[PDB]
């Protein structure tokens, strides 16, 4: 997890450098010199990223290898105007530029690790003995050779070819980096400064930029790893524009199809005396439990509100169990809506489900306004006994046991209650 | 770049496992056992991700460390029903399950590397010499001790406690993984299988999922690293919905949004006998004190004028104190408008606020035309006792104390009474 967090921190630092850089700056992600290679008109900036969240206090030995690497690179590229930067984070170190003295650099050159001595210190400090040079030139080194080289470099005083003073003064800078959360927040704020909203940065821009940095990092070709602020901005803007256009066109086509379906269905919904049955699968409608009561209330308010004109009681059949039906009955009763389920406890009764409600026109009273039950065999037998005029199917419920001869079937392809209300002409526009 | 590519391959494999798993499977990103820990009802699946794009052919030494660590974990957890999987990619190896023989496993245990011998082989093959045991138990080991241990393990034949046959037969499986591009394409195809379009996956879903995996990978707490297919799907759907809503907004001007809201609100406002409640914060409406009386008078003229047809009394709940309510009551009485507040001095009365107005149709008389009070706890209890049909909120007033089950909540975003009148269909044009 630590290595993943360090790589994410390096990617965030690269993104921050890209955002903070000008339009004339070419930045090579995972560059040849260091992790971040920022190439200006005349100065090339190389940044090495390290993560040390688990270290209480910064120590010189923690940065032996990167400092030796940059020293060797400066020795091999002294004629090039390359500025080396070390970006390492330490929780207990103040954020800012930290000076490294020549004595500290000399202490790095006196490290006892054999790997550093053989890789960087040997080239920085050439051995004055030909035997040591031959030992260092061997591709494969035995343990005795390693011990001999380590002892020779620990005991012998060797001059430094690399100009330590000039390197430290001009081509070196050490900065204590921010925390991963702070760096991410700063990068997001920089993304916000480019005209992007905070929500847009959080949802789309930041993950897209992180993925772009990760994809460019793994490219073996270094030329393909060269990026710039303008390219990233254009990529993000194009992605956002394409997403907006797609999400508009799909909705436009969906609205056209739904309007066609609504005009198909509207002739039969204007007749005041039709028996309409609905078979609904709760798993195909978003937020069914929270919105089913209000949908039935609105349907009753529109199609079952006039006591003298509306004579047929609607029916709703749900793909659910009896306990959910009892809970829905509780919620309907709490809202002063009279329904009938046909279930007393866990037993179904034929004579209860199929009874016609009693009406008192003077008192504006109907015994019950709707039938709500489950798709059990007895309920389907009840439906088959008293055939309906219009049979609406929502969610592709298996109606294989229904007798559909001479029954108008209307399959509805919806995914939310707003669309269902729009199709049944209970809304003017979605 | 190779390490970053391997980490991205591991992330893609984790995402593929999450997408291919069922809703009952718990998957731990960067799990305790291996990189991917899939916990089923009875079997725990551990997957180790290895990337070897730079290796021409697969060698047994390339999988020494993961196999040794896996064998040690099995030895320490033999009683647990954990299935261990090794997911390593090789460009020239056919994709599929590759069998590892017992002879190959024995060859792994005979490796000459000191690190493997000291870490895993020592526990798998305990040394029969107490001196070797003491040397292995040392926190710091000298070069002489390392050489002695290496020679002892190279020369001595030690029995294996781990049941190699049972491990290979039941708890071991080695699979040659797909390439990084192929794995990414398969993951994207799985994302499309969830109902997402290819463009949506490419632009939003895949980078968001990769960022989510990376963020969960760096969490030090193992429990917080547990994810599931349903959680990822819900997170992606929520991000898509938020982006869709935000980008659909901010394009139309203020008037177009107000017209859309008006057309949404009209159908409920067109019914003659609905109980409508308003909750208003005066601080978010300009010139509230001067214009509140006129707004209520217009609302009563529009929606509470017909004595025979309008049978429900509007309720206006304000965010003020009792003294302001008394001043408003004075101003209402001065204009021949009958309202009730439920307050007699500084004491609220439950029966004085829930009573129904009396009507004399012959005299065109209604006892009171509106209820106006403050948002105190007793008042909130009174509204909760008698639920309404439409609940309009103007100003983002806190409605936590309201029981908002099976009620139509309609938030209205205005800044003056003109917009409120326009939304409530009492003005033709602003």
SS3 A424: coil
- Best residue of A201, A211, A213 to probe chain B, by most B CBs closer than 10 Å: A211
Across the interface, whether the CB atoms of B214 and A4 are under 8 A apart is answered: yes
SS3 A354: coil
Q: How far apart are CA A125 and CA A119, in angstroms?
A: 11
Q: What are phi and psi of B108, to 5 degrees?
A: -65, -45
SS3 A97: strand
Instruction: Point out the residue among B5, B218, B387 whose CB comes nearest to the CB of A218.
Output: B5
B381 Rama sector, left if φ>0, alpha if ψ -120 to 50, beta otherwise: alpha
SS3 A13: helix
Assigned token pair, A344: 């007393």
**How many angstroms separate the CA of residue B261 from the nearest CA in chain A?**
11
> With contact defined as beta carbons under 8 Å apart, do A336 and A368 qualify?
no
Assigned token pair, A315: 């029916």
Q: Strand A82-89 to strand A370-374: parallel, antiparallel, or no bridges (unpaired)?
A: unpaired
**How many angstroms separate the CA of residue B385 from the nearest CA in chain A?**
11
Does B270 contact chain A (CB < 8 Å)? no
First to last CA, chain A: 47
B250 Rama sector, left if φ>0, alpha if ψ -120 to 50, beta otherwise: left
Measure Cα distances from A147 to A106, A111, A258, A427, B405 in Å. Answer: 21, 14, 81, 86, 79
Instruction: Please enumerate in sequence order all residues whose Cβ is within 8 A of that of A240, keeping only pairs 6 or more positions apart, or say none.
Output: A200, A204, A205, B247
* Closest residue of chain A to B272, computed from CA coordinates: A301
Residues of B in contact with A54 (CB under 8 A): none
Output the CA torsion A211→A216→A217→A219 (10° steps).
Answer: 130
Instruction: Point out the residue among A210, A428, A429 whose CB comes nearest to the CB of B211.
Output: A210
Between positions 120 and 159 of B, the ones with CB within 8 A of A are: 143
* Closest residue of chain A to B216, computed from CA coordinates: A1
Orientation angle between helical segments B2-20 and A206-217, nearest 10 degrees: 130
- Best residue of A4, A226, A334 to probe chain B, by most B CBs closer than 10 Å: A4
**How many angstroms separate the CA of residue A329 from the nearest CA in chain B?**
13
Element (H, E) at A260: helix A229-269
SS3 A366: strand
Q: How far apart are CA B272 and CA B163, in angstroms?
A: 81
Measure Cα distances from B420 to B63, B275, B297 in Å. Answer: 71, 18, 14
Residues of A in contact with B29 (CB under 8 A): none
Q: How far apart are CA B12 and CA B19, in angstroms?
A: 10
Beta bridge partner(s), residue A165: none
Q: How far apart are CA B26 and CA B44, in angstroms?
A: 9
Check residue A375 and report its DSSP letter.
-
Q: Strand B359-360 to strand B365-366: parallel, antiparallel, or no bridges (unpaired)?
A: antiparallel
Instruction: Point out the residue among B206, B208, B217 whose CB comes nearest to the CB of A1.
Output: B217
Q: How far apart are CA A401 and CA A412, in angstroms?
A: 19
SS3 A412: strand
SS3 A330: helix
B/e letters for B72-111, b = 16+ CB within 10 Å, e = fewer, are bbbbeeeeeebebbbbbbbeeeeeeebebeeeebeebbeb
Assigned token pair, B103: 């002879």
- Proportion of chain A in helix, strand, coil states, percent, rounded to 5: 50, 15, 35
Query: What strands, in cross-sheet order, belong to the sheet with B339-340?
Result: B339-340, B370-374, B315-318, B276-280, B390-394, B408-412
Closest to B84 (Cα-Cα) out of B37, B51, B124, B120: B37
Rg, Å, chain A Cα set: 38
Q: Strand B36-39 to strand B276-280: parallel, antiparallel, or no bridges (unpaired)?
A: unpaired
**How many angstroms separate the CA of residue B374 from the nearest CA in chain A?**
25
Residues of B in contact with A197 (CB under 8 A): 246
Between positions 18 and 37 of B, the ones with CB within 8 A of A are: 30
Closest to B415 (Cα-Cα) out of B287, B284, B296: B284
Residues of B in contact with A421 (CB under 8 A): none
Instruction: Point out the residue among A200, A335, A429 whose CB comes nearest to the CB of B406.
Output: A335
SS3 A79: coil
Element (H, E) at A96: strand A96-97
| Strands annotated E in A35-93 | 36-39, 44-51, 82-89
Alpha helices of A39-121 — where are they, by DSSP H?
Answer: 64-76, 102-109, 114-116
Check residue A1 and report its DSSP letter.
-
If 0-12 CB within 10 Å is exposed, 13-18 middle and 19+ buried, where does residue B206 land? buried
SS3 A27: strand
Residue reference for tokens 């551990």: B46
Instruction: Point out the residue among A197, A219, A428 whose CB comes nearest to the CB of B267.
Output: A428
Assigned token pair, B148: 């002695």
Output the CA torsion B113→B114→B119→B125 (10° steps).
Answer: 80
Residue reference for tokens 């990822």: B232
Output the CA torsion B333→B339→B344→B346 (10° steps).
Answer: -100
SS3 A345: coil
Beta-carbon count within 10 A of B193 CB: 10
Residues of A in contact with B257 (CB under 8 A): none
Beta bridge partner(s), residue A174: A86
First to last CA, chain B: 61
Instruction: Please enumerate in sequence order all residues whose Cβ is within 8 A of that of B237, keeping only pairs 6 or more positions apart, or say none.
Output: none
SS3 A5: helix
Residues of B in contact with A426 (CB under 8 A): 267
B/e letters for B280-319, b = 16+ CB within 10 Å, e = fewer, are bbbebbeebeebbeebbbebbeebbeeeeebbbbbbbbbb
Instruction: Point out the residue among A1, A204, A247 whose CB comes nearest to the CB of B30.
Output: A1
Q: How far apart are CA B273 and CA B327, in angstroms?
A: 30
Assigned token pair, A282: 């709760």
Closest to B264 (Cα-Cα) out of B427, B426, B425: B425
Q: How far is CA A321 from the centre of its chain?
A: 36
Across the interface, whether the CB atoms of B200 and A331 are under 8 A apart is answered: no
Residue reference for tokens 């439906």: A383
Q: What are phi and psi of A84, to 5 degrees?
A: -95, 130
Assigned token pair, B180: 């990084």
Method: cryo-EM
Residues of A in contact with B263 (CB under 8 A): 428-429
> With contact defined as beta carbons under 8 Å apart, do A13 and A47 qualify?
yes
Residues of A in contact with B5 (CB under 8 A): 218
B/e letters for A359-391, b = 16+ CB within 10 Å, e = fewer, are eeeeeeebebbbbbbbbbebbbebbeeeebebb
Backbone CA torsion sign across A240, A243, A249, A255: negative
Element (H, E) at A348: strand A347-348
Assigned token pair, A114: 């054999």
Across the interface, whether the CB atoms of A1 and B266 are under 8 A apart is answered: no
Does A247 contact chain B (CB < 8 Å)? yes
Instruction: Please enumerate in sequence order all residues whose Cβ is within 8 A of that of B418, keeping only pairs 6 or more positions apart, or say none.
Output: B427, B430
User: Furthest-apart CA pair in chain A: how many Å?
Assistant: 119
User: Furthest-apart CA pair in chain B: how many Å?
Assistant: 116
Residues of A in contact with B220 (CB under 8 A): 1
> With contact defined as beta carbons under 8 Å apart, do A8 and B214 qualify?
yes
If 0-12 CB within 10 Å is exposed, 13-18 middle and 19+ buried, where does residue B269 land? middle
Closest to A215 (Cα-Cα) out of A5, A2, A11, A4: A11
Across the interface, whether the CB atoms of A243 and B203 are under 8 A apart is answered: yes
> With contact defined as beta carbons under 8 Å apart, do B180 and B12 qualify?
yes
Chains A–B, number of C-beta pairs less than 8 Å apart: 98
- Best residue of B187, B196, B207 to probe chain A, by most A CBs closer than 10 Å: B207
Measure Cα distances from B117 to B76, B77, B123 in Å. Answer: 17, 20, 9
Instruction: Please enumerate in sequence order all residues whose Cβ is within 8 A of that of A61, keeping only pairs 6 or more positions apart, or say none.
Output: A111
Measure Cα distances from A99 to A91, A96, A112, A120, A168 in Å. Answer: 18, 10, 23, 22, 9
Across the interface, whether the CB atoms of A210 and B214 are under 8 A apart is answered: yes
Residues of A in contact with B267 (CB under 8 A): 426-428
Does B246 contact chain A (CB < 8 Å)? yes
Does B219 contact chain A (CB < 8 Å)? yes
Across the interface, whether the CB atoms of B4 and A218 are under 8 A apart is answered: yes
Across the interface, whether the CB atoms of A207 and B208 are under 8 A apart is answered: yes
Q: How far apart are CA A73 and CA B381, in angstroms?
A: 76
Does A246 contact chain B (CB < 8 Å)? yes
Instruction: Point out the residue among A197, A199, A219 whose CB comes nearest to the CB of B1.
Output: A219
Q: How far apart are CA B365 and CA B358, in angstroms?
A: 8
Closest to A216 (Cα-Cα) out of A225, A229, A207, A208: A225
Between positions 107 and 126 of A, the ones with CB within 8 A of B are: none
Instruction: Please enumerate in sequence order all residues whose Cβ is within 8 A of that of A406, keeping only pairs 6 or more positions apart, or say none.
Output: A387
Q: How far apart are CA A299 and CA A421, in angstroms?
A: 8
* Closest residue of chain A to B180, computed from CA coordinates: A218
> With contact defined as beta carbons under 8 Å apart, do A46 and A33 qualify?
yes
Assigned token pair, A350: 């034929």
Across the interface, whether the CB atoms of A203 and B4 are under 8 A apart is answered: no
Orientation angle between helical segments A180-193 and A206-217, nearest 10 degrees: 110
Does A240 contact chain B (CB < 8 Å)? yes
Instruction: Point out the residue among B8, B244, B263 whose CB comes nearest to the CB of A247.
Output: B244
Q: How far apart are CA A123 and CA A104, in angstroms?
A: 19
* Closest residue of chain B to A203, computed from CA coordinates: B239
> With contact defined as beta carbons under 8 Å apart, do A101 and A154 qualify?
no
* Closest residue of chain A to B201, computed from CA coordinates: A243
DSSP A176-194: EEPPHHHHHHHHHHHHHHT
Q: How far apart are CA A368 and CA A415, in angstroms?
A: 29
> With contact defined as beta carbons under 8 Å apart, do B227 and B29 qualify?
yes
Q: Strand B370-374 to strand B390-394: parallel, antiparallel, or no bridges (unpaired)?
A: unpaired
> With contact defined as beta carbons under 8 Å apart, do A178 and A184 qualify?
no
Beta-carbon count within 10 A of B28 CB: 23
Residues of B in contact with A200 (CB under 8 A): 243, 246
Q: How far apart are CA A184 and CA A205, in angstroms?
A: 13
SS (H, E, C) chain B: CHHHHHHHHHHHHHHHHHHHCCCCCEEEECCCCCCEEEECCCCEEEEEEEECCCCCCCCHHHHHHHHHHHHHHHHHCCCCCEEEEEEEECCCCCCEEECCCHHHHHHHHCCCCHHHHHHHHHHHCCCCCHHHHHHHHCCCCCHHHHHHHHHHHHHCCCCCCCCHHHHHHHHEEEEEECCHHHHHHHHHHHHHCCCCCHHHHHHHHHHHHHHHHHHHHCCCCCHHHEECHHHHHHHHHHHHHHHHHHHHCCCCCHHHHHHHHHHHHHHHHCCCCCCEEEEECHHHCCCHHHHHHHHHHHHHHHHCCCCCCCCCCCEEEECCCHHHHHHHHHHHHHCCCCEECCECCCCECHHHHCCCCCEECCCCEECCCEEEEECCHHHHHHHHHCCCCEEEEECCCCCCCCCCCCCEEEEECCCCHHHHHHHCCCCCCC
**How many angstroms separate the CA of residue A3 from the nearest CA in chain B?**
9
Question: What's the resolution in A?
Answer: 2.8
> With contact defined as beta carbons under 8 Å apart, do B316 and B280 qualify?
yes
Does A239 contact chain B (CB < 8 Å)? yes
Beta-carbon count within 10 A of A187 CB: 24
Across the interface, whether the CB atoms of B406 and A203 are under 8 A apart is answered: no
Residues of B in contact with A428 (CB under 8 A): 263, 266-267
């Amino acid at each position: 997890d630590h290595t993943i967090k360090g790589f994410l921190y390096q990617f965030n630092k690269t993104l921050n450098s890209i955002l903070s850089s000008t339009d004339q700056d070419e930045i090579q992600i995972e560059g040849i010199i260091e992790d971040i290679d920022i190439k200006n008109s005349n100065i090339t900036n190389a940044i090495q990223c390290k993560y040390h969240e688990s270290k209480v206090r910064h120590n010189l030995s923690d940065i032996y290898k990167p400092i030796l690497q940059m020293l060797l690179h400066f020795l091999e590229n002294d004629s090039l105007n390359i500025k080396y930067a070390l970006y390492a984070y330490f929780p207990n170190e103040q954020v800012g530029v930290k000076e490294v003295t020549k004595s500290q650099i000399e202490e790095i050159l006196s490290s006892s690790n054999f790997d550093y001595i053989s890789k960087y210190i040997s080239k920085i400090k050439p051995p004055k003995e030909q035997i040591i040079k031959e030992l260092l030139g061997k591709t494969s080194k035995t343990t005795e050779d390693k011990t001999r080289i380590k002892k020779y470099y620990e005991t012998s005083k060797l001059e430094t070819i690399v100009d330590i003073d000039k390197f430290l003064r001009d081509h070196f800078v050490f900065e204590i980096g921010l925390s991963y959360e702070e760096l991410m927040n700063e990068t997001k704020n920089l993304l916000m400064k480019e005209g992007f909203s905070l929500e847009d940065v959080k949802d789309l821009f930041y993950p897209n930029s992180i993925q772009y940095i990760a994809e460019l990092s793994i490219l073996p070709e270094a030329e393909k790893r060269i990026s710039s602020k303008n390219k990233l901005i254009d990529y993000l803007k194009g992605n956002k524009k394409t997403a907006m256009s797609r999400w508009t066109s799909e909705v436009l086509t969906r609205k056209q199809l739904l309007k066609v379906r609504k005009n198909q269905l509207v002739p039969s919904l204007n007749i005041n005396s039709r028996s309409r049955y609905f078979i609904i699968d709760p798993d195909t409608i978003d937020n069914f439990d929270d919105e089913f009561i209000l949908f039935v209330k609105d349907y009753l308010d529109k199609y079952n509100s006039k006591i003298k004109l509306h004579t047929e009681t609607p029916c709703f059949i749900l793909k659910t169990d009896v306990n959910n039906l009892s809970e829905y009955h509780k919620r309907f009763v709490s809202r002063n809506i009279q329904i009938i389920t046909g279930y007393i406890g866990d037993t179904f009764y034929f004579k209860e489900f199929n009874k016609e409600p009693k009406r008192i026109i003077k008192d504006n009273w109907v015994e019950f306004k709707a039938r709500i039950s489950c798709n059990s065999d007895e309920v389907i037998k009840c439906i088959n006994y008293k055939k309906c005029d219009d049979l609406y199917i929502v969610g592709g419920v298996d109606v294989s046991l229904l007798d559909t001869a001479d029954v108008n079937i209307e399959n509805l392809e919806i995914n939310n209650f707003r669309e269902l209300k729009y199709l049944l002409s209970m809304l003017k526009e979605i």
